[model samples]
Target: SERTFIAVKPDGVQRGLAGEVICRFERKGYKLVALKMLQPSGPIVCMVWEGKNVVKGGRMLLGATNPADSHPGTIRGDFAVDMGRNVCHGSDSVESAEREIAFWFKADELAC
Candidate 1:
């Protein structure tokens, strides 16, 4: 299985919609391998996922960075109002995913 990193931005936390986002992914058949809720001085709420083709799959599910251009069913499309306030961030490739996962979680913290 491939792994990807996702983060619910500050706006998503403030709006209290992190659980909804997580539920959607779970319902889509992605495994929630790791999760954390925190208010870092910077962006917080990291999730590590396991699934087939998860890097691209995760990005599609998260929708475009610009909400206006996102499709109706995607997380950003459904919940966001601005690009800067886009609800979440997803790794777009395997290399990026590895880097992001490291940035947010130590080796001992991840199951994979």
Candidate 2:
């Protein structure tokens, strides 16, 4: 088990789909260890996901970079249509997740 950073991007936030995105991961049986919004990314809703291979699996929940090619049931495939409005983001690897989570969250803000 480990952690990964996930985010409901500006489009998802604008569309009131943050809950939807959260629920998807919640339903996937991962623990949400931390949550907050990065106001700079249009107040993107960032999260810390904890579970087995959550870095890779968490990113899988986000699907492809292009929503059009994403699989059904994936976050982007379900709610996203436009090219840039892909709705969500997840760190691609352990290295990136560590970097991204640190960038988005403060040391004091995270829970065990």
Candidate 3:
């Protein structure tokens, strides 16, 4: 099964759009491998976005490394604004997904 890591960024939670973001993924048939809501440290953010296209693409699309311009059919696209108010964050690829799962979940916390 394919899985992806997703998070409701501080902005999304602050704006009360967490549920709105999660529902889109749930409906998309993507398994919610892990979920969490917390302030991401600079290092953590860097790790999550490491080697991903979105980090660069985001900068281009929204003029910042934000998820807002991800896609209306996507978590950020549906509900996001400029960088500061972007709604959510998603792993940009399978490699990043694995790294993110390890970042957020210990080996035992994961369900295979």
Candidate 4:
């Protein structure tokens, strides 16, 4: 298992979808182990999630641009509004996930 990072962008925050995003992942069977709010990015809501295999699946679920039809059941389909909207971001790979998590969260900020 591994952990990944996700952040809700300005549009998502304004629309009140930050909580919705968390619920979506929890419903997807991943565990939300850590969370924090910071804006080095955008007064954003950032979080850490762990799953048996999280990175790639997490990336696809955010609604990739190449395949419009693929996102119908995904997070973007429900709220992203436009293909370019990018309501949120999920790390592209596991290696990158840890890096982003560390940059956004200090050691004591996360939960076990």
Q: What TM-score does each of the candidates earn?
A: 0.93, 0.92, 0.63, 0.85
Give a tens-digit lDDT track for model 1, residues 1-112: 9999999988788898888788888888899888887765554789999899888988888888888899889999889999988869899899999899988887777886
Error of 1 at 104 (Å): 0.8
Q: Which is the better candidate, 1 or 4, if ranked by TM-score?
A: 1
The lDDT per prediction is 0.87, 0.85, 0.50, 0.79
Across 1-112, the per-residue lDDT of candidate 4 in tens digits comes to 6889998877678788888788888888888878977765457888998888877767766677433543677778667766446668899888899999899888797776
Record all residue pairs in model 2 with backbone atoms less than 3 Å apart, i.e. clashing: none
Question: What global local distance difference test value does model 2 have?
Answer: 0.85
* Best first by lDDT, ranked: 1, 2, 4, 3
The parts of candidate 4 lying over 4 Å away from their true place are 39-42, 65-70
Over 4 Å off, model 2? none
Per lDDT, the best of the predicted structures is 1
lDDT string for model 3 (41-107, tens) is 4212211222234333322322224654366555455567676667446666677777776878766
**lDDT per residue (tens digit) for residues 7-62 in model 2:** 88787898998888788889999999999876774778889989998888877887
